[PDB]
Design a protein around this ligand. Sequence first.
Ligand SMILES: O=c1ccn([C@@H]2O[C@H](COP(=O)(O)OP(=O)(O)O)[C@@H](O)[C@H]2O)c(=O)[nH]1
Ligand SMILES: Oc1cc(O)cc(/C=C\c2ccc(O)c(O)c2)c1
Length: 434
Amino acid sequence: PIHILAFPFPAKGHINPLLHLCNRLASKGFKITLITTVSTLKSVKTSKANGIDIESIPDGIPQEQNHQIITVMEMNMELYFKQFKASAIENTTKLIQKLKTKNPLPKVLIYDSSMPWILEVAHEQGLLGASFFTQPCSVSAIYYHMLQGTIKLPMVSLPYLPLLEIKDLPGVQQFEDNSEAVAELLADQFSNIDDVDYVLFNTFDALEIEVVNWMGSKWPILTVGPTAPTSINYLFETNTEVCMKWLDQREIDTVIYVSFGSLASLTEEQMEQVSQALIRSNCYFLWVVREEEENKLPKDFKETTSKKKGLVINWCPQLDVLAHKSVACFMTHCGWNSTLEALCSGVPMICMPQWADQTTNAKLIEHVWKIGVGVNKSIVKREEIEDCIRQVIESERGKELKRNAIKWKELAKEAVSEGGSSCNNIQEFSSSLL
Ligand SMILES: O=c1ccn([C@@H]2O[C@H](COP(=O)(O)OP(=O)(O)O)[C@@H](O)[C@H]2O)c(=O)[nH]1
Ligand SMILES: Oc1cc(O)cc(/C=C\c2ccc(O)c(O)c2)c1
């Protein structure tokens, strides 16, 4: 069998879409070794079913309490990303040298596009290099224009993108002192793209026809998304039993699914507004509040006041939740995976973007794909959230958003089915490796 190495950046929004691609490739006969940091491995709870080998490398940066890697990394981004880079180069080289003592020998390294320097580790080791982009082509295009200097990370017109306000650009300012380094890192994804053996994007053509066509005029790219299979689907604790039995008690189109993803943290004040909005709307809701973020919920919220209509849980099986017929809409921070998974599940969205590409995704959701509405800041107050919920759950606009979401779900299904663009591109990638 052809042996594929996979190295995501150590954050769930990078691990998960690459894992899903690895499961698809393992279904086609490939052997997979997934490279994770020891910090990632601490949260891995289930892996036996996958059949994928997991090999750990050191974090390469300080280990602060039980914080994840990007948490420690954002204390000093320019320094700790560079330390992470130096350590990952050394330790992936070492690991590959060890993997070269075992059959089947590794042939290709699929690595996170935010680690472009792993291409030279791949090539130095005699492997093919595949850069895996975990953001859409539309957002990635902005990073490319930054590298060409067409735009500086300080309305905005870019080829094949909708007119953007400044509020719609990838939110690098939120990182403050780390803003300048975060912008250099994103632009650097394209620094060696001409030397990459395979450029993979987690998107499907019908979602962004023109920018995909534009990018294809420059390089051979492979759109292979959604990689998520819209179990073996999760490495981490997803509380699946609790979540799905609660949803099974809910009627069609009644549940607000709420999640701000794996990284974003809402202030105690913002949390109160969401809690009250969710209560004051008379809707059922499943709200993912990460364990380290409970304590910022109001006093009795998790234990008592949410009990009538809500399920507050520290992590859920998001794919299964978004697929459940009871879920009427998704209040989301607009991370790309949550965006794509909801879109491919036919679930309209309430956009509460926090930073990085989420602001741009929220613009695409509301104005291009037309499957969500955006909250307006003043802090996002409960009245604004409740108004967005009514728009989605009750209003005629909400029925249009749902119909639009269902049309995207159908095109996403075509893309990953036999003869669809993403299925074709994965097959092409698979064949090139033989
Ligand atoms: O309760 C949850 C919340 C999130 N996710 C997954 O975690 C990822 C979140 O990625 P996203 O790009 O949406 O945002 P990020 O966490 O990177 O900010 C996605 O794979 C979701 O499916 C999950 O499995 N369960
Ligand atoms: O190097 C970085 C910088 C950053 O600011 C965030 C991340 C990880 C989180 C993330 C959040 C949303 C996404 O769509 C995504 O691909 C990743 C990684």
